[PDB]
Amino acid sequence: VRMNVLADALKSINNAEKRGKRQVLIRPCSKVIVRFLTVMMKHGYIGEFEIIDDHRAGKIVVNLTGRLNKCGVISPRFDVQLKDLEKWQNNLLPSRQFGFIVLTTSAGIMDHEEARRKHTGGKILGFFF
Amino acid sequence: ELSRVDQRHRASQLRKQKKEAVLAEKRQ
Amino acid sequence: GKCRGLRTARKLRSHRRDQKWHDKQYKKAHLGTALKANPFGGASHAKGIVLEKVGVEAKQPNSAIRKCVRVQLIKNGKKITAFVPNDGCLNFIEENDEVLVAGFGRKGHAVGDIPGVRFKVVKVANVSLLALYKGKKERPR
Amino acid sequence: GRMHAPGKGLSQSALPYRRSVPTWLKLTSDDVKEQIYKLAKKGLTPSQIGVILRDSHGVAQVRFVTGNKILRILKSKGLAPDLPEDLYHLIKKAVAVRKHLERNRKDKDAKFRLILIESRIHRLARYYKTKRVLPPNWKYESSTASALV
RNA sequence: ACGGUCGAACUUGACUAUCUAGAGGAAGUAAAAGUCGGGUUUCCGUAGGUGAACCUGCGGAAGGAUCAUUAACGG
RNA sequence: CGGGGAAUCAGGGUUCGAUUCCGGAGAGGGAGCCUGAGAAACGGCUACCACAUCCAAGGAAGGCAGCAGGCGCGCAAAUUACCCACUCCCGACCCGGGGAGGUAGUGACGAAAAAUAACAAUACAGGACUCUUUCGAGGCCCUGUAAUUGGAAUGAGUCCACUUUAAAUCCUUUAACGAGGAUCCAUUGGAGGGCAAGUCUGGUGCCAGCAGCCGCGGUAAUUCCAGCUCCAAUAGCGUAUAUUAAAGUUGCUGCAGUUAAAAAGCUCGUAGUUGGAUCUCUCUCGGCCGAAGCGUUUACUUUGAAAAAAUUAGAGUGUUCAAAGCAGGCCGCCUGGAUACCGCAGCUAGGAAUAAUGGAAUAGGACCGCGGUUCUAUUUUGUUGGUUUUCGGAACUGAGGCCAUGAUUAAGAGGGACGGCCGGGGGCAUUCGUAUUGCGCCGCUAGAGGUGAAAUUCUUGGACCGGCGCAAGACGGACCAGAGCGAAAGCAUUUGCCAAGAAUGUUUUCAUUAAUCAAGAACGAAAGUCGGAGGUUCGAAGACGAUCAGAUACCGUCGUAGUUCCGACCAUAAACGAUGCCGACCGGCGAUGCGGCGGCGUUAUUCCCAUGACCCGCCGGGCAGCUUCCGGGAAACCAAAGUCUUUGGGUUCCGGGGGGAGUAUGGUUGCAAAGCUGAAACUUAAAGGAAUUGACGGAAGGGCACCACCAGG
């Protein structure tokens, strides 16, 4: 059945970004997906998105800009300590110049640079470049 | 052979045979 | 597909060791049967007493006769065949001579033109075959 | 995708976004409750009560009008059945298939479908024991199956 | 010295396991140039035919080279 | 023996740790003890067991896995030396003792530094600067050959002495001697490719031999044995073996399962694993603060304290450099002897996203006050004996007020309902069709059968044939389609009954009840085995008949088990899509089956209304097809075998070069046949998968020739 809806959302937006489309419909909508899309938007990788509100689990329509090469999710959500984050960003990111391991800490869902800044460790969610 | 005590017993028997042969040769 | 949960560690390690048993190198190293069937018993060199000289026919596409020596090892009593390497070195080996024997290099596999021989003669009567071949030492008897 | 069949059906209900009561419905919550009570005294399952209320009385969703669902109204008043709806239906189906099997020994298809029915019964029994709906010592038996229905 | 405790070990049968002599039996190897002398496409599972192959009975596959025709049908 | 640790290594990891530090164990094997604070002690005792010494034949004495040493064992490992001077330990003790430890000897285990010579002039030789149209002319360096010369510095060694040291040795320091190439002389492997460097010369002739692998050698050997030359590393270089990286060939990172090795025949199902949204700090005691509770508990993350040293990373420091060491530096002083890491598990204080878990739905639920019953207050009834001091605290309870009083919704998750259908889905009974075989009767005839030909066989006691019936078991053709149903194997005459099922439709109900699934359980083509019945056709075996240098497979006639039904067994197929199941996204098209929706019209001889059949679109689930440079792949091909080095959606099974071999053995099931699980020794440099050309066809068509034929000379 359907598990880990963030994987479905990232796979859908990656498939549509590879196809050259301008908008993606992803369903269902959860709060972690919204935070991931917000993190990508603050770095200017996707753009504006709308949360279509059903009384069920909602839907999202995101707008695409061709700035995204690969958006990916890491399953299972491994425990990333702060000392071990360098190995993770050596494995997943394509270069030291760009790319983002999204990870959730008790301070919120953020990037690896913000996790370095705030001295907190968390669980890994994704990467995008 | 298995059964560690039996393997060590085999080794002890071979030891005793070689020791008997050597001691018989050195008495001459 | 692989199980990629968080609590699936024992499944992964059990599967890895069970499929580790399906390797050839791992099974030859760890089963303890090829170690007991090895005449040397996991040793670099062995020392034996010469029983006979054998002319082993070469494998078909090369037509020659290899001068090997059938010896009986001291420490376990096994009969093995060792190839005497160079030309004229067979005349240094005599029957009922003490020989130091090592393998060829393929770790239990028959090497090259000689069928069924894993070993080669290194020393004859406590002097090497190379020193006798080069005329550097004399052998006692 | 069905759990015992290889079919993948999509047929289901689709509520609109409006949870509010329609304007043309001049029925208060207590009148709907009394209709549910008299249907229960007539003797019906909650699904059949909902079907009668939808088809005849025009009540689309009872929990949108009354604010409570049918089984909770029956349980709060005290007219809910001892064993639940779907469990009773599955046990009755098992009883009918078992009676057919004692009639006809050579029916292999009936035996296989009976095994599937009892698998469903055991799954529902485990779920209802987890939620403390059924007592923990409750057990389905093949011999004690028709007496419960 | 009696009794008790801990208790090495000794003797007797059973289950074994190991070391080590063996009459004989069946073989093979080196030495005898000694004596006599056509069919099948490729298979699978079972059963029979002298064990196997192989062939056949039954049930299965293609992992085997689709040419020609095909609009009326109402009075 | 276990750790500290070691080797290798991007990251993950893999392997080793007998061995000097810590802890444990044991003194040939077990056992029992004495003394002592401490021993089940063995350089203490007592036994038995196994070895063994002196013998005067009665007896006595044993314990090197302590230091040297010896035997034996092996591929494999040092002196029967000197000292208690440094380090500490013991004792009645500044004084004695220590095979602890130090010092030398053996030592190419391994690690560090580092000789095997350099320069000047001449003779050639290049590369450059200046002048010349150029040739050339020079003073600018460089290189070796020097079958050329020439002195200068040396350490190896010989060896006074000093120094080192318990006494010595070595190192360091210094007298004297000590270098011309026939010396004070550098080796170990190789020269076809991998892999650097000869198509040199002689000998051999598939011999001797070389070769890790491919391969070389059968008279020109780039590969053998040698000479010369050349190449690599260098006081070191080979070979064998274990192990590590290469190996993304064990894959967590990070492999694979259409055709190359591989997905269980199919479905259920416990354990395991994974699991959809959704919810934004305070009342008392003491000095604005300290105590008391925290807050449902966690997992996660961060900080703090603990985690022996030695090893590792690393700070400082000219051990002459370095490996090392913890020293040292300045004219009595000044300093150092850091720091980091030390998984996991246990402590500790913050964070509250993520992932579990709970808190009120028989309301014996929170918060307030109004009361009862029982147990109790350790002080205020100056000293009291008291029946009562009062007050205050705990547990069971009666009503009341108060809470916006208390249930997130209804997944393009699932279960269950209700509806009209739909299907060769299943079980039971029933009905019909023909063919074949056999029998009875009638008719007319000498042939019928079978083959490439024949032959066996039947047959005027009348075969075959034609006609009328009867019976027996069998089989459900044509309709029958890339159509349908079923979990799969499978399912096709009519009717009735029985219990199921998908899909569709719902503004029904439950509210996570789910997905994949070791153990376990049902079904499971054909063939086969037990007990019964029946045998129409067919038919393995078998019998004949044909056919042959050698036929013993093909062919023809007959025919046993079986093929059929009933009840028990077996669980096997190319049980195939040679392609696990669930879920998401990425192109298009119009045919078909079922269901639903919207419709001009034709039809039931124009139908009076709905209803069935067609026709046109739409939606949902399916069996399929076509098209496409979405992208994949070794490719053929594939809308999945795609969304893969831009590698992580959940989860089951399963592969690791070909054979041995699905074999032996063991276990288990079966009456048996056999099914399931399942090696090793050994053997081998390959085996395979996809495509690409076409010698050669015993493949076929045409054309030509009196060096081919025909009719002839």
UniProtKB/Swiss-Prot annotation, chain A:
Subcellular location: Cytoplasm; Nucleus, Nucleolus
GO molecular function: RNA binding; structural constituent of ribosome
Classification lineage: Eukaryota, Metazoa, Chordata, Craniata, Vertebrata
Family matches, as PROSITE patterns: RIBOSOMAL_S8
GO CC annotations, alphabetized: cytoplasm; cytosol; cytosolic ribosome; cytosolic small ribosomal subunit; extracellular exosome; membrane; nucleolus; nucleoplasm
Protein name: Small ribosomal subunit protein uS8
Primary site of residence: cytoplasm
SUPFAM superfamilies: Ribosomal protein S8
Xref: Pfam families: Ribosomal_S8
Highest taxon, organism lineage: Eukaryota
Keywords of this entry: Cytoplasm, Diamond-Blackfan anemia, Nucleus, Ribonucleoprotein, Ribosomal protein
Residues annotated with N6-succinyllysine modification: 87
Subunit structure: Component of the 40S ribosomal subunit. Part of the small subunit (SSU) processome, composed of more than 70 proteins and the RNA chaperone small nucleolar RNA (snoRNA) U3.
Keyword Ribonucleoprotein in annotation: yes
InterPro entries, A to Z: Ribosomal_uS8 (IPR000630), Ribosomal_uS8_CS (IPR047863), Ribosomal_uS8_sf (IPR035987)
The keyword Metal-binding is annotated on this UniProt entry: no
Transmembrane spans: none
Disease / disorder: Diamond-Blackfan anemia 20: A form of Diamond-Blackfan anemia, a congenital non-regenerative hypoplastic anemia that usually presents early in infancy. Diamond-Blackfan anemia is characterized by a moderate to severe macrocytic anemia, erythroblastopenia, and an increased risk of malignancy. 30 to 40% of Diamond-Blackfan anemia patients present with short stature and congenital anomalies, the most frequent being craniofacial (Pierre-Robin syndrome and cleft palate), thumb and urogenital anomalies. DBA20 inheritance is autosomal dominant.
From Swiss-Prot, chain B:
UniProt subcellular location: Nucleus, Nucleolus
Disulfide bonds: none
Lineage top rank: taxon: Eukaryota
Biased composition (Basic and acidic residues): 1-9
Protein family per UniProt: Belongs to the TRAFAC class translation factor GTPase superfamily. Bms1-like GTPase family. TSR1 subfamily.
Free-text function comment from the UniProt entry: Required during maturation of the 40S ribosomal subunit in the nucleolus.
Record-given protein name: Pre-rRNA-processing protein TSR1 homolog
The gene coding this protein: TSR1
Range covered out of full length: 47 to 74 of 804
From Swiss-Prot, chain C:
Keywords: Acetylation, Cytoplasm, Deafness, Disease variant, Dwarfism, Endoplasmic reticulum, Hydroxylation, Isopeptide bond, Nucleus, Ribonucleoprotein, Ribosomal protein, Ubl conjugation
GO biological process: cytoplasmic translation; maintenance of translational fidelity; ribosomal small subunit biogenesis; stress granule assembly; translation
Family of this protein: Belongs to the universal ribosomal protein uS12 family.
Name recorded for this polypeptide: Small ribosomal subunit protein uS12
Compartment(s) where it occurs, according to its Swiss-Prot or TrEMBL record: Cytoplasm, Cytosol; Cytoplasm; Rough endoplasmic reticulum; Nucleus, Nucleolus
Annotated NCBIfam families: PRK04211.1 (NF003254), uS12_E_A (TIGR00982)
Organism, as annotated: Homo sapiens
GO CC entries: cytoplasm; cytosol; cytosolic ribosome; cytosolic small ribosomal subunit; endoplasmic reticulum; membrane; nucleolus; nucleoplasm
Gene: RPS23
Assembly behavior: Component of the 40S small ribosomal subunit. Part of the small subunit (SSU) processome, composed of more than 70 proteins and the RNA chaperone small nucleolar RNA (snoRNA) U3.
InterPro entries assigned to the protein according to its UniProt record, in alphabetical order: NA-bd_OB-fold, Ribosomal_uS12, Ribosomal_uS12_euk/arc
Curated annotation (Swiss-Prot), chain D:
Keyword NAD: no
Protein origin, superkingdom: Eukaryota
Modified residues (N6-succinyllysine): 26, 33
Keyword terms: Acetylation, Cytoplasm, Isopeptide bond, Nucleus, Phosphoprotein, Ribonucleoprotein, Ribosomal protein, Ubl conjugation
Residues bearing the modification N6-acetyllysine: 26
Keyword Acetylation part of the UniProt annotation: yes
GO MF entries: mRNA 5'-UTR binding; mRNA binding; RNA binding; small ribosomal subunit rRNA binding; structural constituent of ribosome
A Pfam family reported for this protein in Swiss-Prot or TrEMBL: Ribosomal_S15
Modified positions (Phosphoserine) in chain numbering: 29
Free-text description of this protein's post-translational modifications in UniProt: Ubiquitinated at Lys-26 by RNF14 and RNF25 in response to ribosome collisions (ribosome stalling).
SMART domains: Ribosomal_S13_N (SM01386), Ribosomal_S15 (SM01387)
Biological process annotations from GO: cytoplasmic translation; negative regulation of RNA splicing; ribosomal small subunit biogenesis; translation
Cross-link (Glycyl lysine isopeptide (Lys-Gly) (interchain with G-Cter in SUMO2)): 42
Residues in cross-link Glycyl lysine isopeptide (Lys-Gly) (interchain with G-Cter in ubiquitin): 26
Modified residues (Phosphotyrosine): 37
Localisation per UniProt entry: Cytoplasm; Nucleus, Nucleolus
Family per similarity comment: Belongs to the universal ribosomal protein uS15 family.
Assembly with partners or alone: Component of the small ribosomal subunit. Part of the small subunit (SSU) processome, composed of more than 70 proteins and the RNA chaperone small nucleolar RNA (snoRNA) U3.
PANTHER family named in the record: RIBOSOMAL PROTEIN S15P/S13E, SMALL RIBOSOMAL SUBUNIT PROTEIN US15
Record's protein name: Small ribosomal subunit protein uS15
